[PDB]
Write a protein that holds these residues in place. Structure first.
Motif, short mmCIF file in Angstrom:
data_model
loop_
_atom_site.label_atom_id
_atom_site.label_comp_id
_atom_site.label_asym_id
_atom_site.label_seq_id
_atom_site.Cartn_x
_atom_site.Cartn_y
_atom_site.Cartn_z
N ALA A 109 36.57 43.51 49.74
CA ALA A 109 36.56 43.48 48.28
C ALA A 109 37.88 42.94 47.77
N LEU A 110 37.84 42.35 46.59
CA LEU A 110 39.04 41.82 45.98
C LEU A 110 40.01 42.95 45.60
N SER A 111 41.29 42.68 45.74
CA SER A 111 42.31 43.58 45.24
C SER A 111 43.30 42.80 44.38
N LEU A 112 44.12 43.52 43.63
CA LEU A 112 45.21 42.92 42.90
C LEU A 112 46.37 42.77 43.86
N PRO A 123 50.78 46.16 36.75
CA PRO A 123 50.12 46.76 35.60
C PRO A 123 48.87 47.52 35.97
N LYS A 124 48.68 48.65 35.31
CA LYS A 124 47.51 49.46 35.55
C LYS A 124 46.37 48.92 34.68
N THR A 125 46.71 48.18 33.62
CA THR A 125 45.67 47.64 32.71
C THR A 125 45.65 46.11 32.57
N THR A 242 47.15 46.27 45.73
CA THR A 242 46.86 47.50 45.00
C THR A 242 45.46 47.51 44.31
N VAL A 243 45.20 48.58 43.58
CA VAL A 243 44.00 48.70 42.79
C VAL A 243 43.99 47.65 41.69
N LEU A 244 42.81 47.07 41.42
CA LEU A 244 42.66 46.09 40.34
C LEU A 244 42.89 46.79 39.02
N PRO A 245 43.36 46.04 38.02
CA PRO A 245 43.67 46.61 36.70
C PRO A 245 42.43 47.11 35.97
N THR A 246 42.57 48.16 35.17
CA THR A 246 41.46 48.59 34.34
C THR A 246 41.28 47.69 33.12
N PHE A 247 40.10 47.79 32.52
CA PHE A 247 39.81 47.11 31.27
C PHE A 247 39.02 48.07 30.40
N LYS A 248 39.47 48.25 29.15
CA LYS A 248 38.93 49.26 28.24
C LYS A 248 38.86 50.63 28.92
N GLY A 249 39.85 50.91 29.77
CA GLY A 249 39.95 52.20 30.43
C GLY A 249 39.13 52.29 31.70
N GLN A 250 38.29 51.30 31.94
CA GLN A 250 37.35 51.35 33.05
C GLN A 250 37.86 50.50 34.19
N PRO A 251 37.62 50.95 35.43
CA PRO A 251 38.06 50.15 36.58
C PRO A 251 37.29 48.83 36.67
N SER A 252 37.96 47.82 37.21
CA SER A 252 37.32 46.56 37.53
C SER A 252 36.27 46.82 38.58
N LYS A 253 35.21 46.03 38.56
CA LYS A 253 34.13 46.26 39.49
C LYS A 253 33.86 45.01 40.29
N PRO A 254 34.69 44.77 41.31
CA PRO A 254 34.48 43.62 42.19
C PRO A 254 33.22 43.80 43.05
N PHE A 255 32.65 42.69 43.49
CA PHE A 255 31.52 42.75 44.40
C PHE A 255 31.98 43.17 45.79
N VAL A 256 31.20 44.04 46.42
CA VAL A 256 31.46 44.50 47.78
C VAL A 256 30.66 43.70 48.78
N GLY A 257 31.33 43.25 49.84
CA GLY A 257 30.70 42.50 50.91
C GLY A 257 30.81 43.21 52.24
N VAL A 258 29.66 43.50 52.85
CA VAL A 258 29.63 44.21 54.12
C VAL A 258 29.31 43.30 55.29
N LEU A 259 30.24 43.16 56.22
CA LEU A 259 29.96 42.43 57.45
C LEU A 259 28.93 43.25 58.20
N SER A 260 27.82 42.61 58.55
CA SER A 260 26.66 43.35 59.03
C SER A 260 26.09 42.81 60.33
N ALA A 261 25.61 43.72 61.18
CA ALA A 261 24.94 43.33 62.42
C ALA A 261 23.48 43.76 62.37
#
Length: 457
Positions: A109-112, A123-125, A242-261
């Motif tokens: 997943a993406l991070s800051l 920045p936290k925001t 680090t953790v991605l910055p919040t927006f309007k108090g809410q955490p950023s929601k990056p897409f999660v990618g699972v390496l899968s077998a």
């Protein structure tokens, strides 16, 4: 057969995996041979209808839902005790029609990412980033550069306050309930588009520019994934993740990618595959062997992740991933990606309002899948020299240097470049062939200018 044939992508630890397979053969007598075929997400279903592909396939969970709609993947049968050993949400990533379709291996997943010398406290925001940039811009730098051109990178902001791809109704996605056009996404995209209108980021900014600029120490922050850490390591940048910055108090929601077998449907060796994946690979020793060859990032196996998360970079990857959305595995996603790619590009350019770009993206995202692919098609010189912002306020000097060094460039064009770079953080000077780009960058730099040379292609 008899034996086990595994296909894993080339940028993964395919020599570590083989060492796992070596131990398997030592214990079981079953030979496992690992292979890394170019374009294996494509090379697989062309070899899987005829039946003779590989026994087990490694790739990424979002492409596995359509593998399963083609019945091309066997249903895995882990047990309670085993499932409980991996993060619950990683299982949700490997699932179609109420049924587990593959084994989770790695989690990305993406991070800051930030430059500790430029910005000791990230920045936290999101909101505080415009001011941050105004400050840094005066010191000859910029606050943030990430890839604006691709929806995977801009989505974490667009979805924060309430955006979503398709609604989830348990086991099934609802491709008629798209979340690209609600109040949250409008807010996110408006913030991003304003970052560009207020000249805080250049609208042209892509993966290559962003990587160069952050790695050169010209921009204080960037947004990227574990796959990019290596290149920063090479460079002289003491960086944090680090953790991605919040927006309007809410955490950023990056897409999660699972390496899968996943296990092949036309494989006699299904029970051997299960034994390998559950008992050899998905163990601390097993993931450690693959990871010792080429790092996996964060992993789905709790015991090993707890060990790996001693690294705050990996801790941050999982904190961002857990705050994100599992990337839908169904193939309608192709329409979603076109829809959000087009809205951002258009909204950020002025060709559309935010509200109309997203209004269209909601229909395009839910639209007939073929009509949308038809649409995509309805619409040397590979080395770029990039001028960066700096403390040189004498634009006349800079304008003149560009004019002297670069043959094509008019004085006005040279001046506009100078202004765009100092305003936005970065501007393109020219694109030619490697020799020319190198001569020019070298020459521009000797005149006191701050430049990168970039490939992409």
């Amino acid at each position: 057969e008899g034996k086990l044939v595994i296909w894993i992508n080339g940028d993964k630890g395919y020599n570590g995996l083989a060492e796992v397979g070596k131990k398997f053969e030592k214990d079981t007598g079953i030979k496992v041979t690992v292979e890394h075929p170019d374009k294996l997400e494509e090379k697989f279903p062309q070899v899987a209808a005829t039946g003779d592909g590989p026994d087990i396939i490694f790739w990424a969970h979002d492409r596995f839902g359509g593998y399963a709609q083609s019945g091309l993947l066997a249903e895995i049968t882990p047990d309670k005790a085993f499932q409980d050993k991996l993060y619950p949400f990683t299982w949700d990533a490997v699932r179609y029609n109420g049924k587990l379709i593959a084994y989770p291996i790695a989690v990305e997943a993406l991070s800051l990412i930030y430059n500790k010398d430029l910005l000791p406290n990230p920045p936290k925001t999101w909101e505080e980033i415009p001011a941050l940039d105004k400050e840094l811009k005066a010191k000859g730098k910029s606050a943030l550069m990430f890839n604006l051109q691709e929806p995977y990178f801009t989505w974490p902001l667009i979805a924060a306050d309430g955006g979503y791809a398709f609604k989830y109704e348990n086991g099934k996605y609802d491709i008629k309930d798209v979340g690209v056009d609600n109040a949250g996404a409008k807010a996110g995209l408006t913030f991003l588009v304003d970052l560009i209108k207020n000249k805080h980021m250049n609208a042209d900014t892509d993966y290559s520019i962003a990587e160069a600029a952050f790695n050169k120490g010209e921009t204080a922050m960037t947004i990227n994934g574990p796959w990019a850490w290596s290149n920063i390591d090479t460079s002289k940048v003491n960086y944090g993740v680090t953790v991605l910055p919040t927006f309007k108090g809410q955490p950023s929601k990056p897409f999660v990618g699972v390496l899968s077998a996943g296990i092949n449907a036309a494989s006699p060796n299904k029970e051997l595959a299960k034994e390998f994946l559950e008992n050899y690979l998905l163990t601390d020793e097993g993931l450690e062997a693959v990871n010792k060859d080429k790092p996996l990032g964060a992993v789905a196996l709790k015991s090993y992740e707890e060990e790996l998360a001693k690294d705050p970079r990996i801790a941050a990857t999982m904190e961002n991933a857990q705050k994100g959305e599992i990337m839908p595995n169904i193939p309608q996603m192709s329409a979603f990606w076109y829809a959000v790619r087009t809205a951002v590009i258009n909204a950020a350019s002025g060709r559309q309002t935010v509200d109309e770009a997203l209004a269209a993206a909601q229909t395009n995202a839910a639209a007939n899948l073929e009509k949308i692919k038809k649409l995509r098609n309805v619409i040397t010189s590979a080395w770029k020299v990039i001028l960066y912002n700096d403390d040189i306020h004498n634009f006349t000097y800079v304008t003149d240097v560009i004019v002297k060094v670069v043959g094509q460039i008019s004085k006005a064009k040279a001046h506009t470049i100078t202004v765009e770079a100092h305003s936005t953080g970065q501007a393109l000077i020219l694109s030619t062939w490697k020799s020319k780009a190198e001569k020019y960058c070298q020459e521009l730099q000797q005149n006191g200018l701050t430049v990168s040379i970039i490939h992409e292609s």
